[PDB]
Design a binder for these strands. Structure first.
Length: 74
RNA sequence: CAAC
């Protein structure tokens, strides 16, 4: 729950709706961050598309950094 | 729920 960064922009590398997670590449550091489906703000009410630009917070999850509050840019 |  510890917030590391906010209003980070990134590109969805892939998001798998069967597994319910994917990875976003941060535009500011070029590092991949894990994104779980429950972290996406609202058929797939919580999903993002491969190649999409998204805005998110980076928080400290159980297994390291992860995306939170994932939305479109702006 | 950590490389599909």
């Amino acid at each position: 729950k510890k917030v590391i960064a906010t209003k980070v922009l990134g590109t969805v590398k892939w998001f798998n709706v069967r597994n319910g997670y994917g990875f976003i590449n941060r535009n500011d550091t070029k590092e991949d961050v894990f994104v779980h489906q429950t972290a996406i703000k609202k058929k797939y009410l919580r999903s993002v598309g491969d190649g999409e630009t998204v805005e998110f917070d980076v928080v400290e999850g159980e297994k390291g950094a992860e995306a939170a509050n994932v939305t479109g840019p702006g």
